């Protein structure tokens, strides 16, 4: 009875630890992939945001010159 309970407790602790290790590995891999995707999207959406910023300035107020100026400003800021 007591031995059975002790064995059950050990098995439960081992299973919980294994699930935690799997979750930690999954989280680390997801964080690395998310960082890579964040960098790639930062670059791509930064170019897109420069274009859309020229567009928004025009809307509130040719295209190649505005895009080049926005890219130069972004490079200066970075």
């Amino acid at each position: 009875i007591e031995n059975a309970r002790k064995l059950a407790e050990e098995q439960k602790e081992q299973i919980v630890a294994s699930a935690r290790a799997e979750a930690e590995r999954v989280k680390e891999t997801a964080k690395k992939e998310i960082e890579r995707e964040k960098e790639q999207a930062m670059a791509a959406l930064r170019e897109q945001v420069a274009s859309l910023s020229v567009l928004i300035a025009s809307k509130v107020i040719x295209x190649x010159x505005x895009x080049x100026x926005x890219x130069x400003x972004x490079x200066x800021x970075x």
């Binding site: 859309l52 567009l55 928004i56 809307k59 509130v60």
Partner: protein, 563 residues
Amino acid sequence: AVAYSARPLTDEELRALSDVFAQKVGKQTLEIENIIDPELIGGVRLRIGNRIYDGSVSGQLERIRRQLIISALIKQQIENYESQIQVSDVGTVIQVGDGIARAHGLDNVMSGELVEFANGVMGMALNLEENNVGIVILGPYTGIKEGDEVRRTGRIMEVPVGEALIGRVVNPLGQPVDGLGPVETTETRPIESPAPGVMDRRSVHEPLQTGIKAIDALVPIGRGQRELIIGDRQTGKTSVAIDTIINQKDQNMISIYVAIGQKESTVRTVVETLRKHGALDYTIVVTASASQPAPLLFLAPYAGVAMGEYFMYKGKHVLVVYDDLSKQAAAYRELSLLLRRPPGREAYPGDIFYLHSRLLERAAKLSDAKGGGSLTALPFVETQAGDISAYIPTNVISITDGQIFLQSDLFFSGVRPAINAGLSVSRVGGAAQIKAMKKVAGTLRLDLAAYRELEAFAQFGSDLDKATQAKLARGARTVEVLKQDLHQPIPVEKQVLIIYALTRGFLDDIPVEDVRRFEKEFYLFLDQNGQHLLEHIRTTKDLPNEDDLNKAIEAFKKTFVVS
């Protein structure tokens, strides 16, 4: 009058604006001054008295920058055009310090409104003077300086409300502090709202099962009641509250726990205790720890009851716990003294009884016409050296429907819970009990009352052999039955059966040192060969036939080996 522009304005434009505003407002003649501050970008913002008209860059631009956070769709549909003019009613700070502020302006501000400071911190207007407003800051005040600017939001104080708050930890403003992401609700409820009327109620009949034998037998609590738990520190009241919260797993209740002035470490461990027992599927936690500003501590209980009332007014049953009602009173006293309001006894304001009665009268049991929901309240009050003559302890005792007293002498010796039945009352009474508990608890009450008088004279035996040592033995057996351990609440049928066994004289043969083990092994026995008495009590709510009960208890005693 004052116009902020990136570059100084032309004379014709200044005259045109002056004429336009003179015609619109209806003034005789306006003298317009302009500035050349390049903080704006090709735009002007204008100030008429305490009214601001904004049509500049970094104005409506931010109005579309703060919004939309499809992007190109908004940039070409609604972000391209200014989202109208940004109109505000403003004020100017003139005094800062100790967590409050006073301002010039805010002509059309309401009493109890929410205002927003320049750097982003919130405040609540509480003193409308003839020429200034007193504002209590709901956050850090070291970034606010004289000459700052305040703006009106236009909304009375209110909190988010919904089913998305279940299992989350929030602060009295309804913002998460557990770091699990935003809370997605779609409703709000004002913090200060009236109580249900006299004719909107119904008498209390259903019971609230806690799992503690001493409370469930001698001080019963019904659904819709307001029972006070009072005692010194180091008596274990949070344990009583946590056991009561845990016991509601399959009783169709929503629990709310409000922690006022506690340590964040203890709140964290309490939430972790709740999560382990699976009690976070129906619980909401509101926290305002000791390092927070006083207005948050004063506002937390109202937020808790406001979140409870939403479920109450749809036919559900709620239970609200207030960690300490004395810390809230101290915080309110501090706010009142800092605002120069006349003091009273122990420096508390005049409306300190009002503050607590208006809150504790929002717990009710609704009639069938209004839905049938209920809300139960369990406030806590902490005393110093067991003195209940103090101002707040006498204030809260006279509002509630009875109190539970916990002693520090019994806690140190090892009696858990350290409840005192000689000073604990419940004015709802037996109407909050089941038939079996009613039929069983009277003899137990009488026995404990008899034993409490002669408990102190056990050193001198040789007393009347007739009815002194017999009463001492019965009282010791009673006191051993009422002991309990942390967590692990007990079902009501098991409590009824064990108290029946004690009161009918089935425990005299068993010595005092084996009563706890006897009751534990009896509970184990009933789970196997007593599977019909429990079902009869659960289904019928009346205790089973006397002869069957006697035979079952007789059968168990033959197996229990006494040491």
